[PDB]
Design a protein around this ligand. Sequence first.
Ligand SMILES: *[C@@H]1O[C@H](CO)[C@@H](O)[C@H](O)[C@H]1NC(C)=O
Ligand code: NA
Lengths: 36, 24, 251
Amino acid sequence: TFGSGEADCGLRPLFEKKSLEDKTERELLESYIDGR
Amino acid sequence: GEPGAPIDYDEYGGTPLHEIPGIR
Amino acid sequence: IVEGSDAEIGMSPWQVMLFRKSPQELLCGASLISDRWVLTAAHCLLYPPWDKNFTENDLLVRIGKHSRTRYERNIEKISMLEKIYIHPRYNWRENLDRDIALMKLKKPVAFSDYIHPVCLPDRETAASLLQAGYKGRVTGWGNLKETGQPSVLQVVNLPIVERPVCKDSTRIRITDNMFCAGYKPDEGKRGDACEGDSGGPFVMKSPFNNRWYQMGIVSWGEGCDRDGKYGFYTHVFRLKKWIQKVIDQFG
Ligand SMILES: *[C@@H]1O[C@H](CO)[C@@H](O)[C@H](O)[C@H]1NC(C)=O
Ligand code: NA
């Protein structure tokens, strides 16, 4: 019944829950965009 | 764009790590 | 962490410090996955070649920390272990196959702005993120250089590397329970985990639901940030059924 974890998991109080980005998470997201 | 690790579950020789210089 | 930067406050609220009481030293990283379960590398707790065989009473867990050494009043929470569970097929004799371990806290820890659990990946999340060139994030208080300890938690973003390249980079036998990450010599950028970062999380942020997922555990590497070498990480998704079996049976 553990599954993937807490219903609230992976949402950081000081960033995602405040609609604020950290200084380098854009670098991760941009790497998830495939090239040609 | 290529998989870097297989999408499956672990279901269940060689050189030991401690012999490699600089291993951590 | 080599060639990283200071983490921001609250940037990795799942980061756990494994702390040896005597002598007083950082042992390893770890991660918070629920209010009473901590995930780390098996070799942080058991590695006979280096005479490592720790019991529950040897270690202190410190959660919510940022400074490597300063006591962080009303921010950090210290916790003791009720029980350690090492993967029964963890291969310490050879290549650290299945380098994973769970630690049950004696008391549940209160979540806060600084303490929050990371997610474990579902099948689609893993399939969509575990691709070569996709970057994850590694955090830890490990050494800044191969030859040097940071004042605060460090962070570095590293790309997953194609498995044939990982295998060509090392004489060690690589298994499906491992992946490797790091920049290639041609790419210019640098970065790596190092001694003391072992057991900490390799995390990726899902662009689908905005959540952070732990895809890897800092496992081993040949040196730190060497050209043509790569850090190896425990493939958390592939061992997730063992994680769930342990928590669902012994929680
Ligand atoms: C760890 O220590 C205990 C206590 O001496 C011992 O019985 C056990 O065999 C050790 N484990 C390994 C893998 O050496
Ligand atoms: Na490298």
